[PDB]
């Protein structure tokens, strides 16, 4: 019995419940072991055969590509990333009481009991763009331990529903719409480090990572526009970096708001002149907001 | 507010549910803890 990605399945387990992300578009994974190795050249005997031992599982990266789904289940990714939640609203807390990131657990399932299980994991990145294409959400995860296993927890009601219909992006400031959009791209992060725990007590045992601590969070965005001016002497659309701009970005079904932001600009003399805005919140800014709305 | 639950075994009688497995069953085809040398000395 072989195995096939085209009929693989992914299940996320947390809080003693399980989430079936049915609408997976892609995923990629590796697994590896670390080894210690020495060749011990010695003038008595210039040994040619190395001496080596396997010690530890490498921390696997995981990468996922997911389509937006009506029934919104993927909002739990932001919940696990560490946004606070208010119904469908998510907020960054201006300062955070966490030290450890939210640990959770993953099954990869296939026919013939041919299953794999990743025991301790955390989200490191969520990242997407509204670039004139069906918005696909990337996720970066790390996991500290894996094993193969014969079985998995069933999950059947918490299934990611049908994909939401396409709609075009809008950008605005105080209800001014912004002319000549080209793209918007967003990323959110939870930078972390594993605490190295290996000890001489672990000798002749295989070792794993077990705990990590949160270094930082980031929220940031990029916008691409065509260069435009209202009249030659105008000042509002100049190059110079504005600051304390309130900024709002939405589709039909998703909304993001920065109450105050700092804008860098870069200009490119491509065949049509292009401008990139780099966006970041200001230190005094209020909580950035995110909302989701289901299509009827 | 929170509800926690577990399956009701036949051996455990009844007790508060818990956030871990309790029992473990271990399987093997043979016992390695007893040697033939011991068991033979014991009979002999």
């Amino acid at each position: 019995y072989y195995s096939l990605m085209r009929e693989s399945k992914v299940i996320v387990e947390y809080d003693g419940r399980a989430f079936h992300f049915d609408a997976l578009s892609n995923y990629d994974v590796q697994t590896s072991y670390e080894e210690f190795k020495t060749l011990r050249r010695t003038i008595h005997r210039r040994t040619n055969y190395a001496d080596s031992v396997i010690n530890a599982q490498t921390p696997s990266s995981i990468s996922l590509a997911i389509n937006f789904s009506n029934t919104l289940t993927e909002a739990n990714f932001f919940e696990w990333l560490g946004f606070d939640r208010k119904g469908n609203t998510f907020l960054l807390p201006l300062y955070s009481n966490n030290i450890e990131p939210i640990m959770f657990n993953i099954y990869i399932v296939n026919k013939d009991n041919n299953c794999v299980y990743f025991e301790n994991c955390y989200v490191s990145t969520v990242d997407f763009s509204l670039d004139k294409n069906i918005p696909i959400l990337n996720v970066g995860i790390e996991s500290g331990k894996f094993s193969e296993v014969s079985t998995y927890r069933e999950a059947a009601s918490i299934i990611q529903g049908e994909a939401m219909s396409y709609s075009p992006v809008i950008v605005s400031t105080n209800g001014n719409i912004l002319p000549g959009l080209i793209s918007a791209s967003l990323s959110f992060q939870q930078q972390c480090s594993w605490r190295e725990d290996k000890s001489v007590f672990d000798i002749n045992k295989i070792y794993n990572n077990k705990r990590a601590y949160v270094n930082e969070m980031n929220a940031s965005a990029t916008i691409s526009l065509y260069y435009l001016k209202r009249f030659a002497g105008d000042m509002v659309y100049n190059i110079e970096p504005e600051t304390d701009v309130p900024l709002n970005i939405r589709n039909n079904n998703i909304s993001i708001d920065f109450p105050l932001a700092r804008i860098s600009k870069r200009l490119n003399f491509s065949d049509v002149y292009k401008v990139e805005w780099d966006i970041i919140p200001t230190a005094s800014s209020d909580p950035v907001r995110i909302d989701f709305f289901g299509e009827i | 507010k929170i509800i926690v639950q577990q399956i009701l075994n036949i051996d455990d009688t009844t007790t508060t549910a818990s956030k871990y497995p309790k029992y473990t069953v271990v399987l093997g085809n043979s016992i390695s803890s007893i040697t033939a040398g011991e068991l033979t000395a014991a009979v002999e």
Binding site: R17, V109, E154, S157 | I3, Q5, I7
Partner: protein
């Protein structure tokens, strides 16, 4: 939100089924959270399994239900063998591709109520989901 009331149980043929539940109050205003067992006195529990959400669907079985040690917030619920075998007999035939031993049966819902008016005489859902049957070979 329906995201966290919901638990897909799996019964198994020719053998009775039973669960035990602990009710905890919590507040995470301190880390780790403050937690206590809810005193369950004067509550009672109900629920049934039916083959469909539709209003005409069949009642497949009623749970046996019982509080125990109500001061510690425990309660227990169960199905007899006669129930398990009847639903075994009445569930769908189409075996699940990842696990041919198991078959879909239907939907269930557990709701609880206050039998003394306290601050309310009222009822609410506590747990929902759908029920699968593992087939089984030995009697």
């Amino acid at each position: 939100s329906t995201e966290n009331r919901v638990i897909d149980i799996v019964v198994d043929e020719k053998v009775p089924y039973g669960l035990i539940m602990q009710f905890m109050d919590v507040d995470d205003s301190v880390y780790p959270p403050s937690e206590i067992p809810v005193n369950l006195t004067g509550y009672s529990l109900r629920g049934t399994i039916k083959s469909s959400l539709d209003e005409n669907a069949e009642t497949l079985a009623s749970f046996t239900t019982s509080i125990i040690d109500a001061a510690q917030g425990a309660a227990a619920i169960s199905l007899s063998v006669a129930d398990v075998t009847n639903i075994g007999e009445k569930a769908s035939k189409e075996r699940d591709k990842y696990n041919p031993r198991q078959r879909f049966a239907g939907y269930y819902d557990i709701l609880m109520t206050r039998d003394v008016i306290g601050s309310e005489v009222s009822s609410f859902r506590i747990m929902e989901g759908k029920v699968y049957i593992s087939d089984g070979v030995t009697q």
